Amino acid sequence: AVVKCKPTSPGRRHVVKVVNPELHKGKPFAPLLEKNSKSGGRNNNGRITTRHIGGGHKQAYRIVDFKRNKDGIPAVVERLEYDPNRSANIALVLYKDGERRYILAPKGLKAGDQIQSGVDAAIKPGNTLPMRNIPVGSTVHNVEMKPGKGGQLARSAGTYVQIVARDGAYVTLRLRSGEMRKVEADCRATLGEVGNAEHMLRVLGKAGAARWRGVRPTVRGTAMNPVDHPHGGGEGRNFGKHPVTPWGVQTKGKKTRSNKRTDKFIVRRRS
Amino acid sequence: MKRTFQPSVLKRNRSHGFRARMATKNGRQVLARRRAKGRARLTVSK
RNA sequence: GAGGGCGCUUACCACUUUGUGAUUCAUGACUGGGGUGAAGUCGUAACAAGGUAACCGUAGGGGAACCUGCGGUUGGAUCA
RNA sequence: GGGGAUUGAAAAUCCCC
RNA sequence: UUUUUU
RNA sequence: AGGACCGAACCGACUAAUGUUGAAAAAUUAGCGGAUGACUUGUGGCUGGGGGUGAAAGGCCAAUCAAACCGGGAGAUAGCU
RNA sequence: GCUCGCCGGAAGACCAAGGGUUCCUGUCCAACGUUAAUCGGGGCAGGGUGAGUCGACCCCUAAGGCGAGGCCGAAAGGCGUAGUCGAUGGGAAACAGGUUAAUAUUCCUGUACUUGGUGUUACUGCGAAGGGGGGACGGAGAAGGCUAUGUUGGCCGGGCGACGGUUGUCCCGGUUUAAGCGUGUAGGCUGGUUUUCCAGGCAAAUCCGGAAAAUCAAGGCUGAGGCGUGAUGACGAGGCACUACGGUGCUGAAGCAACAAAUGCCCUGCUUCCAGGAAAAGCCUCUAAGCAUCAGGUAACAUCAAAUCGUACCCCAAACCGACACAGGUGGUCAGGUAGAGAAUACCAAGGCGCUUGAGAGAACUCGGGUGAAGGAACUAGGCAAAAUGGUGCCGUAACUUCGGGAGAAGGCACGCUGAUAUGUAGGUGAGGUCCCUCGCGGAUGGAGCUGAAAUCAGUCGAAGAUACCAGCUGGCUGCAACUGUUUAUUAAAAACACAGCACUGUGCAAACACGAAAGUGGACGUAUACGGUGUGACGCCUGCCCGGUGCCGGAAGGUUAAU
RNA sequence: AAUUCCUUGUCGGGUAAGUUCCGACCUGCACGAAUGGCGUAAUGAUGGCCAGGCUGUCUCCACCCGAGACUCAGUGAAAU
Ligand SMILES: [Mg+2]
Ligand SMILES: [Mg+2]
Ligand SMILES: [Mg+2]
Ligand SMILES: [Mg+2]
Ligand SMILES: [Mg+2]
Ligand SMILES: [Mg+2]
Ligand SMILES: [Mg+2]
Ligand SMILES: [Mg+2]
Ligand SMILES: [Mg+2]
Ligand SMILES: [Mg+2]
Ligand SMILES: [Mg+2]
Ligand SMILES: [Mg+2]
Ligand SMILES: [Mg+2]
Ligand SMILES: [Mg+2]
Ligand SMILES: [Mg+2]
Ligand SMILES: [Mg+2]
Ligand SMILES: [Mg+2]
Ligand SMILES: [Mg+2]
Ligand SMILES: [Mg+2]
Ligand SMILES: [Mg+2]
Ligand SMILES: [Mg+2]
Ligand SMILES: [Mg+2]
Ligand SMILES: [Mg+2]
Ligand SMILES: [Mg+2]
Ligand SMILES: [Mg+2]
Ligand SMILES: [Mg+2]
Ligand SMILES: [Mg+2]
Ligand SMILES: [Mg+2]
Ligand SMILES: [Mg+2]
Ligand SMILES: [Mg+2]
Ligand SMILES: [Mg+2]
Ligand SMILES: [Mg+2]
Ligand SMILES: [Mg+2]
Ligand SMILES: [Mg+2]
Ligand SMILES: [Mg+2]
Ligand SMILES: [Mg+2]
Ligand SMILES: [Mg+2]
Ligand SMILES: [Mg+2]
Ligand SMILES: [Mg+2]
Ligand SMILES: [Mg+2]
Ligand SMILES: [Mg+2]
Ligand SMILES: [Mg+2]
Ligand SMILES: [Mg+2]
Ligand SMILES: [Mg+2]
Ligand SMILES: [Mg+2]
Ligand SMILES: [Mg+2]
Ligand SMILES: [Mg+2]
Ligand SMILES: [Mg+2]
Ligand SMILES: [Mg+2]
């Protein structure tokens, strides 16, 4: 559920929260945690390598089972938590054999629900299953890319990949981005749409929110002086440049995409 | 006003200390130079 | 002496004063439309099947009447 | 612009300058 | 497509 | 509840006078902004020179920065004084 | 030595960082000291820092640093595995008093605590670089309990007034006590115990986890403070003695209560929110390889041990960074009395000070102030600067408005003291007594005593009662920018940057992009509801035409075209 | 007009008088749609303009309280 904030003060007037009751309150499941430590957007040579990264709240990491094995053993999702490291929500699961694990959080989620993964596995929202055994047309969560690896496609609040055709030993998928891409079919993949989706609708409302989210400000090239970024200068505003990256690297449609090594798998590019 | 020399022996030793000098081809070269000039205090100690 | 008057004092209150509002008349550079005016310009939308049937509601567009879109009406002509 | 056609006469339009 | 006033 | 209001600490630095061989190589005095936040601050760590860093001023990088400092090429070169 | 004055959330007092003998005593004065100097943070001697429990070393990890092998790379070297370092964080223990010229939680008195070795005696499955638990965690907010602390009285000792009064509802002061040990409260959290079973916990487990039943309702953690004890003592005004007039001996009164009360503590709690909040060791337990009369394990008592380094002094500064005995700079900890809303402020306490050139004079002029006839923005580029407003309560408050706002708009009235209602009220605290009781740090009923605003009425002094210090001026039009924010340390704080929001655009993950001739690494332990780039810059109404030129995308038929 | 040369544009308002202000026109030297356009409550040590209070800002100064300047003593510079 999303909420507007009364304007008892500017920098609140535009806020829009996305509050979810059915979330857990307070600390998460300790043993499934570990350190994180920010980076600053800086390398292992200490140089800023991605700009705009720094500050922001503390953040402890949840382990999150992506590969989804535990074949045969069902589980029962005890609750739904908040993960800080993703837009996605989280599901503490608990297996019959007495083992707990973190799993993403399909669109049905809900505590009480029953989960299961493996070739058998009944096709039900939130269950994992090599795609070979999944009706063509199904909508599918976090998708593995190489059978066994871990799942990497559609990990985000609201995402989902439709299977479109499975001729050959490969599946062809309609990614969220719109590209159509062949995949090994023996690749696992969870059922349903990834959880939340209200996400889109948040507003922040004030600079601070973003600040306390890890995002420093971005200074426009054109504000700078030539020596700094390819733009900038001119007595007052101006431009007359050819929109490029601060490293003279040309922009506005340049694709940069360059594989050959994975071309095959791309059936139809996004539009 | 706040001047530029804010003493600190921890950093002092860490940054220009004997072992830090000694911990690199070029530091080592510094000591060589000073020993060669006959300096009386290679690095700064107790 | 008692009482009284003058005075002083308290209440009520007329002028009068400050602040800020309501209302109403006259007024105003400039500006939008409306009405009137024997023979101006430009097109010619309606009246007949008015040469794209018309009109109402409504929204965008256009020197202008108006054009186009959507639903409704017939207060529409033809053996369609 | 001029000429003729066509108009009841204009305009448009066609042929001769 | 137009055909001044009474 | 709040980059909310008033206001010390604390962080800043809008006006003025004094100072200007100063008490001070940027301050004092009176007023001034912020003041639960994009707040402030201790210690320690990383980023190094056409390199860093920069809510961008060409600002900051040990009292200097349109390319630091130290040493060397080096008695650069100087149709100039 | 007597006064006077200044600071008193410091101009006091402690710690750190830094200094590094500046500390104490003598003694000297050239030079150092903005003068003299007899004095000094100067010279020269000499003295001075005493620890199981304060700190460090030390175990433990962070960021990050180093790194056998290793990958990389002309050489130099770059990066990383195991590991190994690194505190600003986690980890056993000591309080009160007394003493030196100068050291003390270190010496002495008194009284405690920690964990190890050895022994003896009973009682016993103990054991890992491993498993589990714990350690172990954000912000805001809201009271309850309490202590530190203070006020009044009681108590005790002392007092009876330089000038009218002052043996009483009078004056001054003191009225203090630690850890540890015992109790286990206010109050916070969680149902307990037993047996069976298991696809989990890299091996296993008697642990945790999961699942089954069975059986009890009260059980276990946690916890300020109080009370007791420590204290038979320490402290303690004041005495009585000696004095080499600095002080040294001996002695010793009362030593309670009510009220108020933190920003300390219970509270690593509670309620709640979102931005969702270190690691590891110690510690508890589980077992493995192991030892199985042993060895280890538990407990009480006895004993030995607890090293080494630091420990003077300056500390928001005359001892540090500022060339100086420099109005600058400098992290944390304490927090008394009256008035206050208060860590503002004014006056004081404890404590520390009068700023290391003075004496006169009492011009212009400059600096910093105080008052000002009439006038009152005439000033000037500009009301710069001055002047003015200045608390609380209550009534009252326009356009506009994104329905919060604008508002503290504006504008008014009240504000001292005394009496009364009420020799001190509403409120607050709460002792006797009475009873009850699962028995006391219990409950109830009780209202003594303590404490205490606010109102109204009535009276009264001055010119003036928010009587000082403190402490908004307000209003009307309009440019820009939404807003808080950021900026040219040192002539620019803004209309510049930023910004939430919008748009274009790239990126399918070994991503695009960036750091690096690489390995490696940031992006991201993310994955198109994400990540980069660029432009705009809240919100409202909206964003038209032009693809020639320049850039960019798509396109091959042909023409042209490199090495070969 | 943060854009406008001519320019103190012209009319309106305000003032005794107004090259600024506000309101209009529009003859836009040389506005205009995310090189965003045009509005906008609130915010602002932001620019422009007016009005009340208030005043040594000023007519036009005066007096007073302090620190220097001046004389004495000790020390004792500097720019040139
Ligand atoms: Mg951006
Ligand atoms: Mg610029
Ligand atoms: Mg310029
Ligand atoms: Mg320009
Ligand atoms: Mg009218
Ligand atoms: Mg018609
Ligand atoms: Mg028609
Ligand atoms: Mg129609
Ligand atoms: Mg605020
Ligand atoms: Mg100041
Ligand atoms: Mg404030
Ligand atoms: Mg500099
Ligand atoms: Mg050089
Ligand atoms: Mg040469
Ligand atoms: Mg030369
Ligand atoms: Mg002398
Ligand atoms: Mg001394
Ligand atoms: Mg000395
Ligand atoms: Mg090696
Ligand atoms: Mg390395
Ligand atoms: Mg270590
Ligand atoms: Mg430490
Ligand atoms: Mg001492
Ligand atoms: Mg033993
Ligand atoms: Mg462990
Ligand atoms: Mg008490
Ligand atoms: Mg007498
Ligand atoms: Mg008394
Ligand atoms: Mg000491
Ligand atoms: Mg001095
Ligand atoms: Mg000083
Ligand atoms: Mg004060
Ligand atoms: Mg006057
Ligand atoms: Mg004037
Ligand atoms: Mg004048
Ligand atoms: Mg002023
Ligand atoms: Mg003033
Ligand atoms: Mg203007
Ligand atoms: Mg702004
Ligand atoms: Mg400046
Ligand atoms: Mg400035
Ligand atoms: Mg982006
Ligand atoms: Mg802009
Ligand atoms: Mg005037
Ligand atoms: Mg105008
Ligand atoms: Mg456009
Ligand atoms: Mg423009
Ligand atoms: Mg704009
Ligand atoms: Mg601001």
Short mmCIF file of N, CA and C (backbone and C1' of nucleotides) in Angstrom, two decimals, chain H residues 20-36:
data_model
loop_
_atom_site.label_atom_id
_atom_site.label_comp_id
_atom_site.label_asym_id
_atom_site.label_seq_id
_atom_site.Cartn_x
_atom_site.Cartn_y
_atom_site.Cartn_z
P U H 20 13.49 54.91 -15.10
"O5'" U H 20 13.64 54.47 -13.57
"C5'" U H 20 14.93 54.12 -13.09
"C4'" U H 20 14.89 53.22 -11.88
"C3'" U H 20 13.70 52.27 -11.89
"O3'" U H 20 14.06 50.89 -11.88
"C1'" U H 20 13.71 53.64 -9.88
P C H 21 12.90 49.92 -12.48
"O5'" C H 21 11.57 50.26 -11.63
"C5'" C H 21 11.27 49.28 -10.65
"C4'" C H 21 10.41 49.67 -9.47
"C3'" C H 21 8.92 49.40 -9.62
"O3'" C H 21 8.59 48.12 -9.10
"C1'" C H 21 9.28 51.61 -8.69
P C H 22 8.51 47.11 -10.36
"O5'" C H 22 6.96 47.12 -10.74
"C5'" C H 22 6.10 46.58 -9.76
"C4'" C H 22 4.91 47.44 -9.50
"C3'" C H 22 3.87 47.42 -10.59
"O3'" C H 22 3.13 46.23 -10.57
"C1'" C H 22 4.18 49.61 -9.84
P G H 23 3.12 45.38 -11.92
"O5'" G H 23 2.11 46.31 -12.73
"C5'" G H 23 0.90 46.54 -12.02
"C4'" G H 23 -0.09 47.30 -12.85
"C3'" G H 23 -0.14 46.96 -14.33
"O3'" G H 23 -0.90 45.79 -14.59
"C1'" G H 23 -0.12 49.30 -14.05
P A H 24 -0.63 44.93 -15.92
"O5'" A H 24 -0.63 46.07 -17.03
"C5'" A H 24 -1.41 45.87 -18.19
"C4'" A H 24 -1.78 47.19 -18.82
"C3'" A H 24 -1.40 47.27 -20.28
"O3'" A H 24 -2.38 46.68 -21.10
"C1'" A H 24 -0.65 49.22 -19.15
P C H 25 -1.87 45.38 -21.87
"O5'" C H 25 -1.23 46.08 -23.17
"C5'" C H 25 -2.08 46.74 -24.10
"C4'" C H 25 -1.48 48.00 -24.69
"C3'" C H 25 -0.61 47.85 -25.94
"O3'" C H 25 -1.36 47.76 -27.13
"C1'" C H 25 0.37 49.40 -24.43
P C H 26 -1.33 46.43 -28.01
"O5'" C H 26 0.10 46.47 -28.71
"C5'" C H 26 0.56 47.59 -29.45
"C4'" C H 26 2.05 47.59 -29.38
"C3'" C H 26 2.72 46.37 -30.01
"O3'" C H 26 3.27 46.61 -31.32
"C1'" C H 26 3.52 46.74 -27.76
P U H 27 2.74 47.40 -32.63
"O5'" U H 27 3.90 48.44 -32.95
"C5'" U H 27 4.73 48.12 -34.05
"C4'" U H 27 6.18 48.51 -33.84
"C3'" U H 27 6.84 47.91 -32.61
"O3'" U H 27 7.65 46.79 -32.93
"C1'" U H 27 7.07 50.31 -32.58
P G H 28 7.30 45.50 -32.04
"O5'" G H 28 8.71 45.02 -31.48
"C5'" G H 28 9.53 45.80 -30.62
"C4'" G H 28 10.33 44.85 -29.78
"C3'" G H 28 11.25 43.95 -30.60
"O3'" G H 28 12.63 44.35 -30.55
"C1'" G H 28 9.79 42.63 -29.22
P C H 29 13.44 45.04 -29.33
"O5'" C H 29 14.53 45.87 -30.15
"C5'" C H 29 14.98 45.07 -31.22
"C4'" C H 29 15.45 45.89 -32.37
"C3'" C H 29 16.55 45.17 -33.12
"O3'" C H 29 16.22 44.84 -34.46
"C1'" C H 29 17.41 47.21 -32.14
P A H 30 16.57 43.28 -34.59
"O5'" A H 30 15.85 42.59 -33.34
"C5'" A H 30 16.00 41.18 -33.25
"C4'" A H 30 16.63 40.79 -31.95
"C3'" A H 30 15.90 41.29 -30.72
"O3'" A H 30 15.45 40.14 -30.03
"C1'" A H 30 18.24 41.73 -30.57
P C H 31 14.13 40.13 -29.16
"O5'" C H 31 14.33 39.02 -28.03
"C5'" C H 31 13.74 37.73 -28.15
"C4'" C H 31 13.50 37.13 -26.79
"C3'" C H 31 13.25 35.62 -26.76
"O3'" C H 31 14.25 34.87 -26.07
"C1'" C H 31 11.39 36.83 -25.78
P G H 32 14.46 33.38 -26.64
"O5'" G H 32 13.02 32.67 -26.57
"C5'" G H 32 12.54 32.07 -25.38
"C4'" G H 32 11.19 31.41 -25.58
"C3'" G H 32 11.07 30.47 -26.76
"O3'" G H 32 11.68 29.23 -26.49
"C1'" G H 32 9.19 31.86 -26.66
P A H 33 12.32 28.31 -27.62
"O5'" A H 33 10.97 27.57 -28.08
"C5'" A H 33 10.75 26.24 -27.65
"C4'" A H 33 10.34 26.10 -26.20
"C3'" A H 33 9.98 24.68 -25.80
"O3'" A H 33 11.14 23.99 -25.37
"C1'" A H 33 8.29 26.19 -25.03
P A H 34 11.50 22.50 -25.86
"O5'" A H 34 12.01 21.88 -24.47
"C5'" A H 34 13.31 21.31 -24.32
"C4'" A H 34 13.74 21.27 -22.87
"C3'" A H 34 14.49 20.03 -22.40
"O3'" A H 34 15.89 20.26 -22.28
"C1'" A H 34 12.71 20.61 -20.88
P U H 35 16.79 21.14 -23.28
"O5'" U H 35 16.40 22.67 -23.01
"C5'" U H 35 16.79 23.65 -23.97
"C4'" U H 35 18.09 24.32 -23.60
"C3'" U H 35 17.96 25.64 -22.82
"O3'" U H 35 18.33 25.59 -21.44
"C1'" U H 35 19.26 25.97 -24.85
P G H 36 17.32 26.47 -20.55
"O5'" G H 36 16.21 25.41 -20.10
"C5'" G H 36 14.92 25.87 -19.76
"C4'" G H 36 13.91 25.71 -20.87
"C3'" G H 36 12.69 26.58 -20.70
"O3'" G H 36 12.93 27.90 -21.17
"C1'" G H 36 12.00 24.38 -21.18
#
